[PDB]
A paper describes a structure:
MBH reactions are valuable carbon-carbon bond forming transformations in organic synthesis, for which no natural enzymes are known. Previous work has afforded the MBHase BH32.1413 which promotes catalysis via a histidine nucleophile.
To identify a suitable starting template for engineering a MeHis-containing MBHase, we replaced the His23 nucleophile of BH32 and selected evolved descendants with MeHis using an engineered pyrrolysyl-tRNA synthetase/tRNA pair. In contrast to the improved hydrolytic activity observed upon His23MeHis substitution in BH3220, MBH activity was reduced upon MeHis incorporation across all BH32 variants. Of the modified variants tested, BH32.8 His23MeHis (subsequently referred to as BHMeHis1.0) was found to have the highest activity and was selected for further engineering. BHMeHis1.0 was also found to have an altered pH optimum compared to BH32.8, with the highest conversion observed at pH 6.0. Efforts to obtain structures complexed with either substrate(s) or product have thus far been unsuccessful. Comparison of the BHMeHis1.8 and BHMeHis1.0 structures reveals that the 23 mutations installed during evolution cause minimal changes to the overall protein fold (secondary structure root mean square deviation (rmsd) 0.47 Å, Supplementary Fig. 9). The MeHis nucleophile adopts a single conformation in the structures of BHMeHis1.8 and BHMeHis1.0, however a notable 120° rotation of the imidazole ring has occurred. The first four mutations introduced into BHMeHis1.0 during rounds 1 and 2 of evolution gave a > 4-fold increase in activity. In contrast, these mutations reduce activity in the analogous His23 containing variant (BH32.8), and therefore would not have been selected if evolving with His23 as the catalytic nucleophile.
Author numbering: 1 to 231
The structure:
């Protein structure tokens, strides 16, 4: 029986397009009048952050603030603009102003509440991530919020999923995990016995669909999967 449904954040609850806008607005603020295209700075940021962060996948937790500050330091040195003071605060303000949920999120979360444990798992620092969920208006819709800072390891290390399950009080066999990353989300959660749902909104990850138990393009399909699993 499925008693718990856990959600990834970025690309699952939190819009990738909204995240791009957030990040572009950060770059615009950082640069000011510096004669660099903010979109080009953003493109370079995304490359470095992907690589720097891929080195931490499954590894012991390190504050993401520190990792991203080091990326920005490299970018400032590369392009010649002054390293921005209070970068973290700029980023938090931009995320609260421009971050966006996918349109079905509130409905889906509310539909599961009262029948299942509703959880979110964030590969992030706890205070900023929780304040962002609060700004988007959904912090209190969750029975549990679990983070890499709490578990001590980044996805797909099993500890973050183990902790989420403990908060819900069930073993993995009783839970579903929905995420958009085949290896870090589907593979990671399967390692604890969870039922993995790969969210492929644009149908662009077919070559990785066999890494998950179910594939969906819209979070409204999740409750139908859970209902069927429960008879
Ligand atoms: Mg994601
Ligand atoms: Mg995350």
């Amino acid at each position: 029986m499925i008693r718990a449904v856990f959600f990834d954040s970025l690309g699952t609850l939190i819009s990738v397009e909204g995240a791009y806008k957030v990040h572009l607005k950060i770059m615009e603020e950082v640069l000011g009048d510096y004669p660099l295209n903010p979109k080009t700075l953003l493109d370079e940021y995304e490359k470095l952050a992907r690589e720097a962060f891929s080195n931490y996948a499954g590894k012991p937790y390190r504050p993401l603030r520190d990792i991203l500050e080091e990326v920005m330091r490299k970018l400032a040195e590369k392009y010649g603009f002054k390293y921005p003071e209070n970068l973290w605060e700029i980023s938090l303000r931009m995320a609260q102003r421009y971050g966006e949920l996918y349109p079905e999120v509130v409905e889906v979360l509310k539909s599961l509440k009262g029948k299942y444990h509703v959880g979110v798992i964030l590969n992030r620092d706890t205070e900023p991530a929780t304040a962002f969920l609060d700004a988007l208006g959904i912090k209190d819709l969750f029975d549990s919020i679990t983070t890499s800072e709490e578990a001590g390891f980044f996805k797909p290390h099993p500890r973050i999923f183990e902790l989420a399950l403990k908060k819900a009080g069930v073993k993995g066999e009783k839970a579903v995990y929905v995420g958009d990353n085949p290896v870090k989300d589907a593979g990671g959660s399967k390692n604890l016995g969870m039922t993995s749902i790969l969210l492929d909104r644009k149908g662009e990850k077919r070559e990785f669909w066999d890494k998950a138990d179910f594939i969906v393009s819209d979070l409204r399909e999740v409750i139908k999967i859970v209902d069927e699993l429960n008879g």
